[PDB]
Design a binder for this molecule. Sequence first.
Ligand SMILES: Nc1nc2c(ncn2[C@@H]2O[C@H](COP(=O)(O)O)[C@@H](O)[C@H]2O)c(=O)[nH]1
Ligand SMILES: Nc1nc2c(ncn2[C@@H]2O[C@H](COP(=O)(O)O)[C@@H](O)[C@H]2O)c(=O)[nH]1
Ligand SMILES: [Mg+2]
Ligand SMILES: [Mg+2]
Ligand SMILES: [Mg+2]
Ligand SMILES: [Mg+2]
Lengths: 218, 217
Amino acid sequence: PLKPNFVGRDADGNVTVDGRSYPMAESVVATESTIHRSMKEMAQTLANAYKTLKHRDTHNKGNSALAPITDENPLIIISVLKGSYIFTADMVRYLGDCGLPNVVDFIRITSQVLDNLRFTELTGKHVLIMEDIADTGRTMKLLVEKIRREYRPASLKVCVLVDKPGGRVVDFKPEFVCLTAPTRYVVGYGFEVNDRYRNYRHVFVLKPEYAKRYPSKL
Amino acid sequence: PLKPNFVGRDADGNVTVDGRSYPMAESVVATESTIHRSMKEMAQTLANAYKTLKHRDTHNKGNSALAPITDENPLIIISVLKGSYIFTADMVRYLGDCGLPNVVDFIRITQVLDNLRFTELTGKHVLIMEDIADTGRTMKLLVEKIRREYRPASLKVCVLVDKPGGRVVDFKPEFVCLTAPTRYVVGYGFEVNDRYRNYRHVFVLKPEYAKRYPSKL
Ligand SMILES: Nc1nc2c(ncn2[C@@H]2O[C@H](COP(=O)(O)O)[C@@H](O)[C@H]2O)c(=O)[nH]1
Ligand SMILES: Nc1nc2c(ncn2[C@@H]2O[C@H](COP(=O)(O)O)[C@@H](O)[C@H]2O)c(=O)[nH]1
Ligand SMILES: [Mg+2]
Ligand SMILES: [Mg+2]
Ligand SMILES: [Mg+2]
Ligand SMILES: [Mg+2]
């Protein structure tokens, strides 16, 4: 993933990355190597932010003292399906590289809650939401409020792969931001049009003429 | 991921991979570079198996002819949560390298906890991506259910790990990355009460660690 990537155009005028054409792409927001550089650095930022904190001991319920973040009481990561699963898969491995014990549960929402968390012991825990992109801010603002009210974690913060601060309509600022995008619809590396393009290794601005390309329900 | 990993033992006799100690590990099943080599080879295998197949056109429903596998009508991948999500993340990008259009939806089972949201699977080629087959009961039941309820044109299973020595029902995955003995493994998607899931290598767990984390998450 961290081999340098070469952006160009083919003879048809389509964007290429490393010689492969992407007819749906207007431009390149970030290539694979750029994305993974930001994720590795972000994992270290996260390790540094969390590794000395303490929170409620649920490994041993007979204990009353707050406990360090360990395999016994790891950082709780809430990963928002579907858009975050690839991002989360790469991030948790880089967090392992940095020695930060964590466990992952998923929640699936619209942008409301389709699939609930199955972790039940979040009160008094350090909890980190891993989310694909913040645009108007409304989805995360609502999710953060929901988790805070239902569980009352010791802390609740958001890490996004991409922030689009130009789209904000509510006051919402993710504590941790890997990449920033212009105020456009992006696809690639988790981002999709009706699930297409999600498995690409780079993030692109979608051509407007592709926005309605796959209207048939899956 | 694909530079060869060094496997050793530290002064305490614990397994090391690239200088990092894993006290919960009895031994290494496969390191990261080996796993990713097997996944890249599997992605080519999958692309060869599917690239020329034809299935129902739901992109243009006015077309009665079967249609090739394309962005318009991709391979449907069902990924089994939670155990398959890292395997699936890596595999779909290798499938992209091999030019096989695909889309992923998730099903959560433990019993079915969270159903698919895709609904239009009739007459589609569908591939299940799963972490490990042991007794085979889990996949035998999932396959029967998907066949019955969705009626795909074809339904196959790709597992990261097969433990054929544990097979005790009529189930055989079509596509297998790695084959392992009948031992409990952890790392790279495999866990003990969610621990060790984010490690980059697959290990045999020490039996002493099997009950290390009894408390509900
Ligand atoms: N694929 C894609 N989805 C986006 C983009 N911007 C926002 N989203 C979607 O909208 C959600 C956030 O919406 P918000 O509530 O912040 O406006 C994201 O989680 C994602 O589903 C984008 O540029 N590309
Ligand atoms: N972590 C881990 N899980 C296993 C192992 N073997 C079987 N499983 C679990 O059991 C499920 C399938 O079991 P089966 O129904 O084939 O016996 C897997 O999806 C996984 O949850 C193993 O060696 N390690
Ligand atoms: Mg998401
Ligand atoms: Mg999504
Ligand atoms: Mg699970
Ligand atoms: Mg699974």
